[PDB]
Design a protein around this ligand. Structure first.
Ligand SMILES: O=C(O)c1cc(-c2ccccc2O[C@@H]2O[C@H](CO)[C@H](O)[C@H](O)[C@H]2O)cc([N+](=O)[O-])c1
Ligand SMILES: O=C(O)c1cc(-c2ccccc2O[C@@H]2O[C@H](CO)[C@H](O)[C@H](O)[C@H]2O)cc([N+](=O)[O-])c1
Length: 154
């Protein structure tokens, strides 16, 4: 099982930064929408749904410390969860060799000028993989989400 970010090197586990582009200006009462499906894609390394991979996001996925007061909802594979995650999410099965954009979005409500600083971590999303055959070769991933640009709110 592997993923990449913006079509870069293949990733089988571990921590990777994911750089996003956000609307530079938002109004009071407006949320930021981070569509991670545009950045992270994953696939099964055999194809044909041989040794199908089972992927979920993990309780403890959270905002960056600086943004701890923010509110959020996380969309994963047809379901929306409050963020930070206090439960794991549903499981997404991956079996094609052709990369699948991850069905992952984050909706962020700023609480408490600059609402997002360019270059700062926004959120840390933990992901778990286990496959079907043998031990399933469980793997842990972290996606550290970072904006390329600042966002301001009047
Ligand atoms: O385990 C890894 O860390 C890892 C494995 C592989 C890989 C490459 C070639 C063939 C099979 C591979 O892994 C198996 O894939 C199964 C179906 O997805 C299934 O996931 C199996 O459990 C798995 O062993 C690639 C990378 N990579 O980042 O390019 C990473
Ligand atoms: O090892 C497992 O069985 C397992 C691991 C994870 C996981 C994936 C990604 C990042 C962190 C993860 O678990 C945390 O690991 C901490 C120690 O490193 C620490 O042990 C935390 O308690 C733990 O939650 C998810 C699942 N899962 O089923 O979604 C299972």
């Amino acid at each position: 099982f592997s993923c990449n970010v913006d079509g870069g090197s293949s990733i089988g586990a571990g921590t990777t930064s994911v750089y996003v582009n956000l609307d530079p200006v938002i109004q009071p009462g407006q949320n930021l929408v981070v569509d991670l499906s545009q950045h992270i894609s994953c696939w099964n390394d055999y194809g044909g749904w041989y040794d199908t991979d089972h992927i979920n996001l993990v309780q403890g996925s959270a905002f960056a410390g600086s943004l701890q007061s923010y509110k959020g909802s996380l969309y994963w594979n047809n379901v929306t969860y409050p963020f930070p995650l206090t439960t794991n999410t549903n499981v997404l099965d991956i079996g094609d060799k052709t990369p699948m954009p991850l069905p992952l979005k984050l909706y962020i409500t700023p609480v408490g000028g600059v609402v997002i600083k360019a270059g700062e971590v926004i959120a840390r999303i933990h992901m778990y993989k286990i496959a079907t055959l043998g031990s399933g070769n469980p793997r842990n991933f972290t996606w550290n989400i970072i904006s390329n640009n600042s966002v301001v709110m009047p």
